[PDB]
Design a protein around this ligand. Structure first.
Ligand SMILES: Nc1ncnc2c1ncn2[C@@H]1O[C@H](COP(=O)(O)OP(=O)(O)CP(=O)(O)O)[C@@H](O)[C@H]1O
Ligand SMILES: Nc1ncnc2c1ncn2[C@@H]1O[C@H](COP(=O)(O)OP(=O)(O)CP(=O)(O)O)[C@@H](O)[C@H]1O
Ligand SMILES: O=P(O)(O)OC[C@H]1O[C@](O)(CO)[C@@H](O)[C@@H]1O
Ligand SMILES: O=P(O)(O)OC[C@H]1O[C@](O)(CO)[C@@H](O)[C@@H]1O
Ligand SMILES: O=P(O)(O)OC[C@H]1O[C@](O)(CO)[C@@H](O)[C@@H]1O
Ligand SMILES: O=P(O)(O)OC[C@H]1O[C@](O)(CO)[C@@H](O)[C@@H]1O
Ligand SMILES: [Mg+2]
Ligand SMILES: [Mg+2]
Lengths: 431, 431
């Protein structure tokens, strides 16, 4: 005796009457601890695992109004040490409220945590709140890398609002020397034999993994081994306009219109003028995306995971038709566009689970052109631009427009490029 | 201008007119090199990557008729060394024919390869045939583990056909001591800095990964970190009989019949008499599997990936109806049941890609009960019992029967258990 939920179409038994994890970042400054923290979090939240970053740096920038210099981080700075410890403890406080009282699942503790003492303290914290502890250490003693990092995300930090490169660059170098003496890296073969951890070496050149307590830690591990930092570009766009677009019909597998092909031709000119040494092209298995890719005269690959969302019994229909034929359904979708699943079809949530492999592969690749569909494109875009599940189903991803995503600082930079070719508009807001 | 293939329903441009990899196993005997090789291969072939194992041991057992003793593996055994080298070279010969002439993609070289010399030779081989080289080393100096391994897959080997445990166990111990002196493990921080490799330590307790050249090596890495060897059991069965089963209609989302529920009740008694400390239950999101799981009064989890194959425009239909309504389609499926994809639906190939995450999770778990559907069940079973894509769509997976899969030696042992409850028969051979 079960009843099927109206929105998610899930069968639940009629009533009629996974321990949370604390990810601990470890490493000297300018080692990508925050970079990793944010990206990790962006991913986890995307695939549905509620994650939040707790940057002890911000707690510090909060308590000590405006920034001083490296003197603040001197081991002999008795007062700063007091404040820094109170920052770490305040953050763990907020962590407890997240994992135990706010429904959070993973809490990333973003700090240097370069001493066994500090780590043992966190372990204790976890041990008493019934939380698992997974460590991620970033080791890299390459002056070129450290130097480059200092330039990319430090010299512009709010701490150096009143500094130039020459001085900021020096203050941070001294800042790093502060942690160096007492820095005790993880020792998975001795003192840290029992800790579950992954040590990222030379920006992913080598990894040392210890244990792994569950699938969640398993994924995280997989992810870090696939992301990289080499500069590259990811272009995203939909198929050229198609017959169904003109008729305003959803789903289906129609072919490009006269304009759609025109757009496909423009896309070719665009890719051409991008001057990319290499470029991979991915499409869905639906006709319209393939016809578009063909116009590029470049080898491409088809992914069934990139097919537009499945509209179920509403495929081939027009919104008007749905509104009339399946009124109640048309309403259930407008009130919960993300979780709503079409009868015998999918939901935006289903797309995310279906696209996970695509995202993981995009992180591994260099330059990639993905020609897909509206809903599918929103999903991917929501990942790169960190858009909540609430706004995902409404992001604007118009026809004939190329979204150029480039890596910058801690996230992704986006550039819209309309290839100057008319087409209908398939976008529709909440109502 | 494209045309859609009739079987796979894929759009291809009308005509009208990934370097192969050699996986190198490394390690002393009784370290699971062959275990890993077979499992790795079983998996890769399942997800579509043509892989083959080249056990240098078999080449040896082939050339030297019947087995001697550990004297054969003595470093001072000038003649044996000659034969052993000719075996390794003959196997690489067959590797070349596989990766370059037989359409193979991955070739697992199963040997001790415990010396830098031997390894350099293989590198050279790869370097000249344009093959990538990925190494997997298994290090474990635990006497209990080594001892146990010697018992589980050595003492019964065809080499010891005329030996008892007491003597076989001793001959293998001496055999191991032979390789020990010249054994040079991988050194990812010195001599082997440039080699792409994964070093499995203490049966997966710790890993040291170096590089990783592509996604294929990325997956392999992920897999090894998720499989384990602790004893556990995996039960597989379909939902209890349902309305559609009675009407002989495919797809749909109907509920259990009177018998189906009866079966669900029997399943409860079965699980109960299994005396399992723990047991996870997974179902699909279709009503029939959930109703069945409910009868167990155990917490279960729903997976959309476990939903029966999507019959497309044929859902809810009876084979008779399909045969009549979509004759041409009914024929295209009987001639190629694995690759055939239903209009707007899936193929067995699609199921495999859809089930990959399930398989990966089953490898991570201990005891798991999976209540699914016919086609879905075949897919999973094909993985555990290593059944080709040709036989997969025809494996017999009857209603009300529990397949009990247990780990043994290098593969999985299967036991069928009919819970003694009538039901229709949904199996149908090729015709
Ligand atoms: N595994 C890694 N090793 C080294 N650098 C990395 C890295 N992952 C990312 N980066 C680089 O690090 C920079 C971001 O550094 P981030 O600010 O996250 O360091 P940090 O958190 O270690 C310093 P701090 O404790 O001083 O705030 C970017 O330039 C990024 O490309
Ligand atoms: N990573 C690992 N470390 C140690 N033992 C493992 C292992 N993976 C599997 N095993 C165990 O090893 C046994 C299979 O060993 P296998 O025969 O594959 O070893 P081997 O190939 O190293 C020996 P040889 O070169 O003498 O043939 C099984 O008992 C299995 O459970
Ligand atoms: O985590 P710890 O050991 O308290 O060091 C924290 C400090 O590190 C920094 O990231 C500087 O490297 C600061 O923003 C932060 O206050
Ligand atoms: O995401 P939305 O607003 O529900 O629109 C989804 C529809 O958009 C389309 O791509 C048409 O523009 C259809 O294929 C799909 O069903
Ligand atoms: O790979 P190597 O160095 O030639 O050693 C191969 C030998 O190892 C064995 O697996 C025994 O440990 C034999 O079956 C095989 O002939
Ligand atoms: O694998 P086959 O032989 O095509 O049968 C598949 C059908 O079996 C069923 O499970 C019915 O027994 C249907 O849901 C499914 O479409
Ligand atoms: Mg930081
Ligand atoms: Mg072997």
């Amino acid at each position: 005796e079960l009843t099927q939920s109206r929105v998610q179409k899930i069968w639940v038994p009629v009533d009629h009457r996974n321990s949370p994890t604390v990810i601990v970042m470890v490493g000297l400054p300018a080692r990508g601890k925050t970079y990793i923290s944010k990206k990790l979090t962006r991913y986890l939240n995307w695939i549905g695992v509620p994650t939040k970053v707790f940057n002890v740096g911000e707690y510090r920038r909060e308590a000590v109004k405006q920034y001083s210099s490296y003197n603040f981080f001197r081991p002999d700075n008795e007062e700063a040490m007091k404040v820094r410890k109170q920052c770490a403890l305040a953050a763990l406080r907020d962590v407890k409220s997240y994992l135990a009282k706010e429904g959070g699942q993973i809490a990333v503790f973003d700090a240097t945590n370069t001493t066994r003492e500090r780590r043992h303290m966190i372990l204790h914290f976890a041990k008493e709140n019934d939380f698992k502890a997974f460590f991620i250490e970033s080791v890299c003693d390459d002056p070129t890398v450290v130097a480059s990092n200092i330039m990319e995300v430090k010299i512009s930090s709010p701490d150096y609002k009143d500094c130039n490169s020459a001085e900021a660059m020096d203050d941070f170098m001294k800042r790093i020397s502060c942690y160096e003496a007492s820095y005790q890296p993880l020792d998975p073969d001795k003192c840290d034999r029992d800790l579950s951890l992954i040590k990222v070496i030379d920006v992913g050149r080598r990894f040392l993994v210890n244990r792994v307590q569950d699938h969640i830690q398993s994924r995280i591990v997989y992810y870090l081994m696939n992301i990289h930092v080499q500069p590259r570009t990811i272009y995203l766009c939909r198929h050229g306009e198609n017959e169904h677009n003109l008729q305003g019909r959803i789903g289906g597998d129609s072919g490009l219109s006269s304009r759609g092909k025109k757009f496909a031709s423009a896309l070719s000119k665009f890719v051409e003028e991008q001057n990319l040494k290499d470029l991979r092209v991915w499409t869905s298995q639906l006709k319209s995306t393939i016809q578009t890719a063909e116009a590029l005269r470049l080898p491409y690959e088809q992914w069934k995971a990139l097919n537009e969302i499945d509209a179920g019994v509403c495929e081939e229909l027009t919104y008007e038709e749905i509104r009339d034929t399946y009124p109640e359904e048309y309403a259930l979708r407008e009130q919960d566009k993300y979780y709503y699943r079409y009868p015998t079809g999918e939901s935006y949530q289903d797309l995310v689970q279906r696209l996970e492999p695509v995202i993981m592969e995009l992180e591994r690749q260099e330059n990639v052109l993905v020609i897909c569909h509206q809903a599918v494109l929103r999903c991917l875009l929501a990942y790169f631009l960190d858009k909540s599940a609430e706004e995902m189903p409404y992001l604007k991803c118009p026809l004939h427009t190329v979204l150029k995503l480039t890596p910058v600082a801690y996230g992704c930079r986006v550039e819209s490029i309309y290839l100057n070719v008319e087409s209908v508009c398939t976008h529709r807001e909440r109502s």
